[PDB]
Amino acid sequence: SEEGPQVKIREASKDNVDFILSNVDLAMANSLRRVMIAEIPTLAIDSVEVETNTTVLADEFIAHRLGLIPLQSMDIEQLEYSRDCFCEDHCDKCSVVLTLQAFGESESTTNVYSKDLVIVSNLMGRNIGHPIIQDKEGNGVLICKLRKGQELKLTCVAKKGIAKEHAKWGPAAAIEFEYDPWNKLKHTDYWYEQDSAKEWPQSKNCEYEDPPNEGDPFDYKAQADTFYMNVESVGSIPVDQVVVRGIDTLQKKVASILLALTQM
Amino acid sequence: ASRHGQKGTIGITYRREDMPFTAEGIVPDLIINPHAIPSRMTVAHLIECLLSKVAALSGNEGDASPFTDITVEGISKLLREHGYQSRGFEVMYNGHTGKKLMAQIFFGPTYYQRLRHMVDDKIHARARGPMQVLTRQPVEGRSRDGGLRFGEMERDCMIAHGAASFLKERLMEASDAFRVHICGICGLMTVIAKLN
Amino acid sequence: MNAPDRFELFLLGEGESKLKIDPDTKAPNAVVITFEKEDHTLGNLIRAELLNDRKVLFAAYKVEHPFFARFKLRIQTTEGYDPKDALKNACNSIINKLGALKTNFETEWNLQTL
Amino acid sequence: SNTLFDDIFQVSEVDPGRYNKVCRIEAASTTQDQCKLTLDINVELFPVAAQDSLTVTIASSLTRSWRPPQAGDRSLADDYDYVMYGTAYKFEEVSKDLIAVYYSFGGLLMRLEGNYRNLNNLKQENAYLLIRR
Amino acid sequence: MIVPVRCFSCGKVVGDKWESYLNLLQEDELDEGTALSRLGLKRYCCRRMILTHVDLIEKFLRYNP
Amino acid sequence: RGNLMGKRVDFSARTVISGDPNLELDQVGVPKSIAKTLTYPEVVTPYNIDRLTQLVRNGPNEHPGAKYVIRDSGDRIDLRYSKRAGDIQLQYGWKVERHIMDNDPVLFNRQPSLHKMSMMAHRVKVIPYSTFRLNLSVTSPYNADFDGDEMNLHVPQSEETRAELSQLCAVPLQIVSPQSNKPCMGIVQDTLCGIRKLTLRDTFIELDQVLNMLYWVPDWDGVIPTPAIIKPKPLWSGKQILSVAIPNGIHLQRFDEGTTLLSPKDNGMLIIDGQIIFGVVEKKTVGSSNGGLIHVVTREKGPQVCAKLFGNIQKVVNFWLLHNGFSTGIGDTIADGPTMREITETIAEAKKKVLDVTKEAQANLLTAKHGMTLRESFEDNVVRFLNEARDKAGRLAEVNLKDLNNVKQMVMAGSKGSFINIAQMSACVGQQSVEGKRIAFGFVDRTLPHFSKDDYSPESKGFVENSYLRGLTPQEFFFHAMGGREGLIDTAVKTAETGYIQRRLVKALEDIMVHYDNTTRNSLGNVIQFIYGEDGMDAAHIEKQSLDTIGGSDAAFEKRYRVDLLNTDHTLDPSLLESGSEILGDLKLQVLLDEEYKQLVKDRKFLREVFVDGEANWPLPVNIRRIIQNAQQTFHIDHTKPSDLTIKDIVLGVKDLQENLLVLRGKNEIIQNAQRDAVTLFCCLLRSRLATRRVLQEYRLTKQAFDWVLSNIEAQFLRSVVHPGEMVGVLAAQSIGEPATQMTLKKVTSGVPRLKEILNVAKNMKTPSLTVY
Amino acid sequence: FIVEDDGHKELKVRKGHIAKLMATEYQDVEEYTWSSLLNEGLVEYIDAEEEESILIAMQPEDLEPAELDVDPAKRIRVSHHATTFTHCEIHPSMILGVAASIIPFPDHNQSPRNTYQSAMGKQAMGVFLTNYNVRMDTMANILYYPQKPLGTTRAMEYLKFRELPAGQNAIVAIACYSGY
Amino acid sequence: TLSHLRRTNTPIAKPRQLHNTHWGLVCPAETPEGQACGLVKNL
Amino acid sequence: LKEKAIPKDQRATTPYMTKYERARILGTRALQISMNAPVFVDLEGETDPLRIAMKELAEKKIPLVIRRYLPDGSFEDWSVEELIVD
Amino acid sequence: YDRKVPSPTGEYVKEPEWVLETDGVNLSEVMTVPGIDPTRIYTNSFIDIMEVLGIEAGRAALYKEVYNVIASDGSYVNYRHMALLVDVMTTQGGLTSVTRHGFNRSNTGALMRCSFEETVEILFEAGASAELDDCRGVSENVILGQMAPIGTGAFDVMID
RNA sequence: AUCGAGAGGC
């Protein structure tokens, strides 16, 4: 295939992908994973204006929860950042507005779910702002629980966001990184009471690579270009799109550096 | 502060990418220095991290009740069943480098308690402020917006430094400077002086 | 209260030049480049590709403080080689490697069935 | 210019020491009674043996920044496996007309005996130590 | 007071799992670890966010106002 | 007392302090809100109107702003309220209250003010977050910790006041303590730990890391160090990059244990010209104590170079340490099973010995120490057995514990850790002590209601076999609780007593300063000391050195110091001096040599008289050895070449140098006598240090090198003399006070109670004692 | 507890009585009470002056006649070595305070640090009561997401600390990172 | 709140020091820090 | 006592300026610079009054008299140019 | 003691010396007994040493005792500070306590004495005494608010 | 204000 880094995927899932990166400098791999945590843009609620708060949870608490709730962001690149946009507060191109008013007539406490929550603003033909529910019941993440006789009315303005600006906007929760599983590079020195082999379990990634023969001397020159990584998705952006967007966003930062150099 | 003796203020907040990461990807919500532990001699903080890791993987609450016979070897054996290291040292990679850290680092679940003391309530600064009338000195307290007391001990430290002008300013111009007129013939400030 | 907002660390402000170039003192082909509103992620990769290049004698990346996202890179090159030229070649090479990896991953994922 | 001193040394003992990467080397001059040597070497970088004859060389050359090696410009200063750069910590005389030479390279120490190479050894700090298998 | 949305370390959403997890442990008399495994919260931080959490919301609900 | 000695002060701020590695030691991180609050009046000057007009335009809320503008008339102008703030013009002679700006002097103080070192001037840095920032080294003089300690900052309000804080109260100036002849501040915690781990020969640095560390040093030569290993792979020692950190021209030699030049143990240090030849960096080289690298750099290069060196070492070592990482861990406290069994049998044998001594006590067949009650003697023996058992168990644990485990790594580095700490966590806590006793029977004949009556066994009396790791018996825990409770009560009591003491000492000694005559007098003028310190010299710049004439064989002193031109063996060898061939015979030069030897003999007898111990090392004004080493490197002295210097010229130059150093000016016979007395010991040291045979043999000395040594000794002595006007009494009171706060308390009154009885003339003595010889 | 001769001296309480206590406990028939235990005479109330005349054992298990490989990790316990014991302490942990019962392992830690934590826990944030939102106290601080501790003392169930926790089970790493 | 509700205050021959008589009735380790340490105890 | 002049030849005081003396001289000259009093020495690249006072001292351009005092009260007057700075 | 004395050759060797330690001190009687070197004998209480041997010996003993206090902790303070304290007590012929009575009785100053203790009683007795304060003292000048003739204030500055 | 109590940092 393509010259340079080559990726063989061990396992696939909508939530997670397991792949092997080959002919990759570790600097770029760690840079990529940090980009996936931070640089990838995703839309979560930035403004919450509540009309009525009968529920015991305070508005700050509920608003933080609402910001945490995942919102679909496949077309978020089509969406323009509110700071980049021209409208004074919110327009349809930059923001997606989600309203929710729940009152509990039931004596039994009525749940408030992410699937309850509905969109006011026009979609404009893009897959943006839909709350994601992986629940088998389809019930959303419960924002609040309502006693009988309690009503909560809120408006949410969700904007494009950066994980470095707030943690909700990060698409991926856990990235698993493995390199030098046999410790041939010996970048780490093990702490063992009697024997290192007993003290530390063998890795699965360890068994993929060949075992080091005890007789061969350590080679200083070798630098590990083979890594074992896994990516887990919240679902606001699909896994493959998250890793491709990590690659693309790193490219965008490098290209920004280059164009700034040309302007200089 | 932990449920054991050691307490700390947070010196910095670090983003998850910056923080060291295990193969599992778990980032510590908190990082403590290894050096305090030996002088404190609080083994139980370490034991609590180990037991809480074992309990989190087991789903069964760990009993820390005092004078109950426990084996740190036994808890480490349960951790071994989980595959996590018996010592609880977890191999970590530094966030910026992506390089494996040369020394494996202790990683555990530890109960920690938010203390009542918070910086914003403590921080008071006054360049100029309200003055108590009789002393002509500054008022006392942050609510008063008053200046901090210059210690006599602090004054002695400044005399040891030997800087007379700074002490003179802190002692008169910064606090209760006053102009008086005194008669030489009285020897006492009997004079009453109309400048107009 | 006192703390600066996260977006300011995220995005450039007050007309900050994204890159500032200052000639290094006491070194002929060395230059210090200040990257503003940039993180360790980009810097380590630029440095690694500079180190891969034979012509560049020196390349190191330092951040003055975790509070402020300013990243400083110093480049010392072969005589007759522009440090900026080396930096541009390294950056472009980074981009080619990223593109090749993305194409390989996309082909593999299409091969992946789930 | 030229190598200051050249010798062939047979190592009687290799002591692992407290350090794993670095072991100490106790050797006597091959065919020569006067030179004794104590060395600090990295066994991971160079395999060592309890008995071994290793060619030992010291060279002044082959305020300059270390230039990363490009195979074209680099003429190998040696085919020797091991090269270290060191500064002498002390030049002393164990007995009159019996000079002892002490060279420290990166905190890795070296001891040499004898007079016949005292003119070969110089006060100048720079030295390049060359071990051939 | 309420189930946290996400594990603070990972960021993986845990709010959806709580009600189903309570059911799971009730119906099967499940040990909490097995129920967490069914939830998929393999990381012990998500597991801590579920196990250590207590819903004080019900007590506030019990209050008539 | 409340108001006049101590005032609430304007321009005072206080905040929780968190320490910052990337912030330099001299500067204090100052919150942006605090810097905005605090104002410094600046009078407008043709150079300052431009920037100041910009600041006034920026306004009170903007950090480079002004809160108020003062007219030449003086009516206040409040910037936020006035309409004028946008359109103001600053006429000449109008003050502007600048917002506190970076690199401005302020005073940072910790409320316990045991020391003038505890309150020092710092350069303003402006930080975004709210916590006051500080360096890690500067914690030690302040005795502050980041766990919620709150510190106070005071802003100078005049140019003279700023000048005073910058010229006297600055951190670099107070680096070397006047008292204890040691620098106050040293590299602490991870840095210190890291530095040792960096200096291990096993530790090696790769070229990418080498380049990043070289970059990390704020000032770098730009010349990559030649790799320690070249041919197998480019490798650099951690000592090599560390040497890049050490300032050039610095030489340090020290042997904690007897070090072969080969140094297989790597104990001790040799550094030449800022490049470390051998050793693993430990605490004492990098510590606050005298003979540390801080002291040497501070004296040779000045204070600012030392502070910058502090910063650079912190940066490089912290970067390295982050790459390697550190973690205390449970397993470090955990010890091997075989060693643990040996520990348990140690406890068992101690228990059997205690039972045997108890049985002998029961039999009434006993040996009574004179003046000790038989129970008292029995108690002393049992307590000693338990103490030895605990210490032996700790030693077995220390041998068992690997070099790799991080608790021992901290101890080797000198990071936080104690042998008792390792012992108590690993093997045995020890025997609890209340009121200098084993645990008493509060219940009649029972220490605890569970324990049977009249049991004097260690378990009843509270000795804890178990370690902290092992877990404690409930009885053991209660006994430990009693001991700790007594300790806490004692701590608070000590604080109160020490505060009252320190105040008494300061109030007593506050009046005394060194006057211009060098007599230490109060305001009335009663002379406490005719010359301060009985040498007429400053407490700083004095470092302990060895006097060569004291000690050793008399014949050995003759061989080292005596050259007789007439006897062939006695005469200096012609290889040593060019004049050597002409120095045979030459009887007049020889009578001068005999005179110098007679003076050395008189000095040796005088030193033998001053100290019956005659210990070699005492505090001395100028370190000759450093000057000699700096001369050898500076003049590139080669040992083969015979010295240019005339023997007569060496002897006459030494005498001239003695004539050169004057503690007291002018010629008065009493003043001249006091001056000879003041420099008697210093001259003795100088004569020992510069012997004609030694000047020619021990080090080869060109004539110019000897003259430079003489001039440097003169200049250093003149710098070492006490500055007139220094307040000796307050500093002395604080000098007793801060150790006294740090002081923690066969039987004698000791510690704080003893100090109490000493300080107030006490009719009673808790422990009178007469020594009979 | 009370210990008297059975035969071989035995603790007055018996397993069947504990089973009746557990039967009263699961109900939330015959009702069995601590007051009922006292009326039974199985447990006595002891003053300090009365404590001087008694001999007591920390463990009921110690009392049963003892006449074996031992794991090294378990703490060395001195054999009680006493033939007569009037009573047996209910549990060692009952000597502790509420704040000490909060402390995870005071047995494995130095006592002054335990004292400091006992002082600090009162300062620590939590939910003081459920009526807080109804209540109007001058100052109140309540954690967003209180988490029950992972390692809990048995006494904590009587403390209601698990029901109303005052801390978060934070993931903690012990490491040196950038010197902060 | 619970700890405050169970407090002992002794107004004030070694009261501060933990007593063998204190065992099983008073907490071994709970006391105000610094001043009046052991003067006030928790049951 | 009164007009207790100490002879210029017959002066016994440290030739070196006391650190406090130099600090006070720098502070006074820096006030004069803040006062915009004329500065004799040429000024290059520094606006700060303290830098100007230090440069004047190194040049020895500052004319000032430091009067050393004694417990008797007799006064010695030393010109700033005379005192040695080190 | 295992003390150390010069050898015949000149090297410092160590000889053990038998020494007695007494619970009580009666120094005047103790020095005038057979079998003891009068010079070597020391009393831990400096007061008996001062009465027997004069004031300078008492000062030396006082400094030795303070030195023992600092040395038991292992701490070191430079000899001049401890010395200055001992000299302060010694310069008055009778030993003067650091406590209020010894420090206040010294007729030097008025506001230092009042600043330590018995402020108002000292002011009363000073008004009865008509004490005139030189105001030279540091404390007195702090009350006055004038700059003390201390450090920077010690030397006056005049035009050239 | 005054008085008291509590807490922090040693």
Ligand SMILES: [Mg+2]
């Ligand atoms: Mg603290």
Ligand SMILES: [Zn+2]
């Ligand atoms: Zn818009």
Ligand SMILES: [Zn+2]
């Ligand atoms: Zn009048």
Ligand SMILES: [Zn+2]
């Ligand atoms: Zn998680």
